[PDB]
Amino acid sequence: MIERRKIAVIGSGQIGGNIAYIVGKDNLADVVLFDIAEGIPQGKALDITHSMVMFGSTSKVIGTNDYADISGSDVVIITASIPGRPKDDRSELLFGNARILDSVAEGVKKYCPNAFVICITNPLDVMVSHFQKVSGLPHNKVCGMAGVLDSSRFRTFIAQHFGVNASDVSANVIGGHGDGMVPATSSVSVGGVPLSSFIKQGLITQEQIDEIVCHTRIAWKEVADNLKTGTAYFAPAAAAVKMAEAYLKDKKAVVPCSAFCSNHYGVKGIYMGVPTIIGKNGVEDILELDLTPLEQKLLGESINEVNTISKVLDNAP
Amino acid sequence: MIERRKIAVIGSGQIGGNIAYIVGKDNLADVVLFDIAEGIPQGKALDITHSMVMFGSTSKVIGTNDYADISGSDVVIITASIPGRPKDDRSELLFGNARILDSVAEGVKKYCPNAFVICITNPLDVMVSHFQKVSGLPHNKVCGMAGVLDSSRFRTFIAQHFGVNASDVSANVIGGHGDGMVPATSSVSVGGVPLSSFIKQGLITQEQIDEIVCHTRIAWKEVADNLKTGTAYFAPAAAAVKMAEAYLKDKKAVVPCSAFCSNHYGVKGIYMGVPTIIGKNGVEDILELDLTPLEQKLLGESINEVNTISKVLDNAP
Amino acid sequence: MIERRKIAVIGSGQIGGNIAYIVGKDNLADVVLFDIAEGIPQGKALDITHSMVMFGSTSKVIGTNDYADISGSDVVIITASIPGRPKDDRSELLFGNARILDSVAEGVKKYCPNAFVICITNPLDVMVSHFQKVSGLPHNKVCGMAGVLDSSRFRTFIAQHFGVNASDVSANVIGGHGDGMVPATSSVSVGGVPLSSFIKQGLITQEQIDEIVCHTRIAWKEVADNLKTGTAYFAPAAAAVKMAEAYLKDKKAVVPCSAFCSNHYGVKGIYMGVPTIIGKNGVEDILELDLTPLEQKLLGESINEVNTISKVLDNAP
Amino acid sequence: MIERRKIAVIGSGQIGGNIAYIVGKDNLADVVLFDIAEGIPQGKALDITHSMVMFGSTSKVIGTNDYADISGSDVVIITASIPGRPKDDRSELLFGNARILDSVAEGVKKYCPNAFVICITNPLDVMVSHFQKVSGLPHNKVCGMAGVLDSSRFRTFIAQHFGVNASDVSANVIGGHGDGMVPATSSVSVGGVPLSSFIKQGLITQEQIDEIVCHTRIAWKEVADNLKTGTAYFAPAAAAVKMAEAYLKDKKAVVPCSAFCSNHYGVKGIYMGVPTIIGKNGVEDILELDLTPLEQKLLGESINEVNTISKVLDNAP
Ligand SMILES: NC(=O)c1ccc[n+]([C@@H]2O[C@H](COP(=O)([O-])OP(=O)(O)OC[C@H]3O[C@@H](n4cnc5c(N)ncnc54)[C@H](O)[C@@H]3O)[C@@H](O)[C@H]2O)c1
């Protein structure tokens, strides 16, 4: 018969609460806000529940500390993390958050092993790989939100330069969600017009493109330094919801995200940011961009960065 | 000539940021997030800006500490407040927030005097009255968000009892935004059916109605007790957005809010929670509910409660 | 796993095409446009398909003359009808459309017996009863769209008098979808305010209320006389989509529609317009309005009107 | 001061009615449906008005035969045309529709000369040029809907090949709205990946690309051959709405439409399909695609084809 869609949000902090808010507002699914901290998810769920009638949504949103409540979830979005913002690298959270995901993996494997898992917890790419390993869930049913956020920033900065609608900018960021991420300028277009043409027309310079690439890479610090007590959470929540939409509505949407890449980009099995097709069977395919030799090299360096952090985790305390 | 609609959010804390988020997502308007605290409004605006392309919105969202930036605002929403949740009474914030709203009133008077002003800062009804005095804005262009939140909770709790969609519940809360708020059970209907019929049908007891009424009055504590930093903010943000919508889209919408009532409900000039008609000229009308003798009495007590706290403010030692 | 929602529209004429258009635009489901007339559904589906990318929807919409294509449909909406608008009574289509529904019943019973069936074909109430009888589908899984259209008109005319947002008018029409339909003025409210109060305030007269009741009853002719070559189709399509939403999203929405009423309104088993709760198990409940003796009588006359047309069909050629 | 946005739809046939429907549903604006035929625009407006409460929209929709009613319109959309589908060429309607647009131009010049005008009437590119001449409106406030429809079909057919979401396909059709329209395969990307890469990857053949290009050019016939009354109307309506949105919400959106190109693409003053930037000042910019030699040649032929039919109109015998 018909059953309501169900999204479980593991971690009801800044990002987690926003996901429930937006999911409830859109009436995409029922939401289960999970957290180990007492009160937090219950208070947020009640608050969000009062807003549902205002939004004309019948989504049910509840708070809990019981993994039994995530039973039958179609999608699980993992935001759970140790406290304290990274000082200057997402990898500072590696050891703690790895242990958290061990716990989350057991809850998911027990109560909703057929769920599509979207990881957000940093260090993103290594956390996704660690989760798939420990949970044993199929590779196509486990991925990480990152590329949608990085590319959205990349697109937005390009859009803000030209003064155009950012939806009409096509632009991807690939590789690991770190300093090594690769905003692929070579495949950027604005309504079909490539950046090379705008350079010739004198409407953008290569230095401005380089500033935009740098800005994209360091964007997390710009937001964090202004917020003071945490990291970005409005956009990361929105990005996760877009990914959830792609799965639940079987969109076959092109989603840059951390997925298990084995026969593309010259890698033989690793979680990293790539353009994917997402539908009812999770990550259904990976697209291969035309990268320049410089971009292929930068990707290689990003791959090394992911492997480095991955090897550190293997030799953790 | 077409100009983008512009909404100023004065105070970029919990509620402020959510307003900017939702307004941006809906592409209702451009947003200026104002706050005295450094970084905070700039951080949230940047984060929210990155989500705009994800939502398919071209809304601009910026942060600032300069009232000149709210120039030409169509709507101004005031969340500015001193920190810390009230222990068990919204009046505790009286003098601090009154001083805050003085500077806000000066900012609005100078830079966007023709704007529609929606006050949220507690103690709500008194703050609205105070802002209008100091600012000198027309009574119909100044009002308070409260009734939509309180009525939404009332509707939600009624809907939860019958197991029906809350959107199909008509229910109003009137009077001041405090313990003396009056959920008008006499005017409640569920798809056309009044509570009296549900009693006779044995689908609800007067006891259950009394529990719902009480639950509405103290709903703020239930949320605040669980959050453990501050008070409700997801639903208050949404309520303010609905009010902004009614103005910007000239809905002629029935909106329970704190408005200047000078004839109806046996009062000659006071700001209190009443069902209004909001459109392009602000609060365009006030509707007279058919209140019972009991409800008239409870409303009278709320009027006194509001006049008390107002009188305390007028006597600045 | 996740499967896309699927709505089958049986009859791809004026109403049928609009349903697919709106369902596709909202991305509520995939749509199968069925018609026996060659070309029509194929042409409409291709046209609507080109619009999907404009709406940002991934809904698939196809045209067909093969009942196999409606296999696994969650909802079936029946608009199929003999040609030529009713001269002055919906019952003129009774004999022809009854035979059409015999055919439709066989397709549904074979290819999607677990579907929620929403009938639109006139004469609505008798056609719904005839379909349930011939198809053998459970009473709660078969209903007729009518009350949403009639009540929407009723609400709109009231709203247009007062100059208010029609969403803030609560008003029901019950009984059969014919001249005998009963707009229940006694349970009408505008933001909680009953009509009796507006009469006292001099803002509406009982004659104006009577004009509105009459206008509601004869609304179909007003539209038809202006369109010339057919009957209303924009609003009837929208109404069917709202009903489909209620089922697919398990809203528990209050939906006036033609449902099998057996223990309410003093009837012991008949399809007629009543306020229902609609969710994932179809018509899940019926609400009992407080009718005046005059309204109870008018309902009785509507019931007799339905029985009369029903008995004519039993003694058809 | 807030005023409701206002859209005039001149011609209330197939496309006109759909525009009013969708505009109303989205609450983008109020609508005035204009037509010379009696009843038709009034019938559709009344029907559509009944759907407004169902959609939760307060948009007004009215019918009229009086140009005074389009006074103060922000946008004017012209679907007015002689009846009957073209047999196999849009130019067949040339002289009839040219005379129709004379009276429309007079109506707009008198009652809403500051409006943004979106022409739909075929033969599109010539009609746009003709309307601008007779009306005397600024070149940037007058344009034609075509590219959005043609590009949407192009995107749709590309997306259907790869089995991906069409929203993630960037693709442009330029030149005149006719057989000589140029689907620019060189500027096509799917999530950043160009067609050249898909060839090398063996995911598409040049033959399949040629079929898609051809399919785009003759797409109108495929629909028209199946409808058996008139031509496509669901997607053209939606395309016009997207253009209206871009203007009313100042999107700075990339919109392929028939615009006055006086420098780019080696032309000095002609209306043809080009990718524009649309915002509050109408057609604010034109983008230069990086066309191949072949595409430059095909575009040149389209320019000649457009100049031919334009020249035939200028010589009124
Ligand atoms: N991938 C990205 O692009 C991206 C972007 C921004 C932030 N992030 C990351 O997302 C994570 C969440 O960020 P945030 O701002 O929401 O953090 P937060 O501190 O606001 O929330 C974290 C929540 O997790 C909860 N938690 C802790 N241990 C838990 C456990 N064992 N099980 C369940 N819940 C637990 C905490 O109680 C807290 O409520 C962080 O690790 C951050 O670095 C990722």
Ligand SMILES: NC(=O)c1ccc[n+]([C@@H]2O[C@H](COP(=O)([O-])OP(=O)(O)OC[C@H]3O[C@@H](n4cnc5c(N)ncnc54)[C@H](O)[C@@H]3O)[C@@H](O)[C@H]2O)c1
């Ligand atoms: N009306 C209602 O129904 C309702 C519901 C919930 C909360 N509230 C009230 O709304 C207010 C805001 O709640 P919150 O959770 O957003 O509080 P918050 O502390 O999160 O945000 C308040 C913001 O105001 C800013 N501020 C302080 N002084 C200022 C000044 N002079 N000018 C501009 N900004 C200034 C602070 O920097 C802070 O960011 C509170 O007073 C709360 O009691 C009302």
Ligand SMILES: NC(=O)c1ccc[n+]([C@@H]2O[C@H](COP(=O)([O-])OP(=O)(O)OC[C@H]3O[C@@H](n4cnc5c(N)ncnc54)[C@H](O)[C@@H]3O)[C@@H](O)[C@H]2O)c1
């Ligand atoms: N319940 C209501 O409130 C309400 C409101 C308006 C109209 N209606 C009714 O809805 C029905 C449809 O109206 P319309 O304007 O869409 O009619 P229409 O003539 O535009 O469309 C009817 C379609 O049904 C098709 N058809 C005929 N026989 C069929 C069969 N055996 N199987 C499948 N399809 C078949 C026709 O080819 C045609 O395309 C009419 O009977 C009308 O009276 C009901």
Ligand SMILES: NC(=O)c1ccc[n+]([C@@H]2O[C@H](COP(=O)([O-])OP(=O)(O)OC[C@H]3O[C@@H](n4cnc5c(N)ncnc54)[C@H](O)[C@@H]3O)[C@@H](O)[C@H]2O)c1
């Ligand atoms: N640009 C495109 O891509 C595109 C796509 C499809 C169709 N079209 C064209 O758009 C036009 C409209 O298509 P349609 O299906 O809506 O046609 P239609 O015949 O359904 O509607 C045309 C309407 O114009 C009205 N009309 C006639 N003379 C008039 C006058 N002097 N003033 C005002 N109104 C008048 C008629 O009464 C009729 O209702 C056609 O010319 C068609 O070729 C263009």
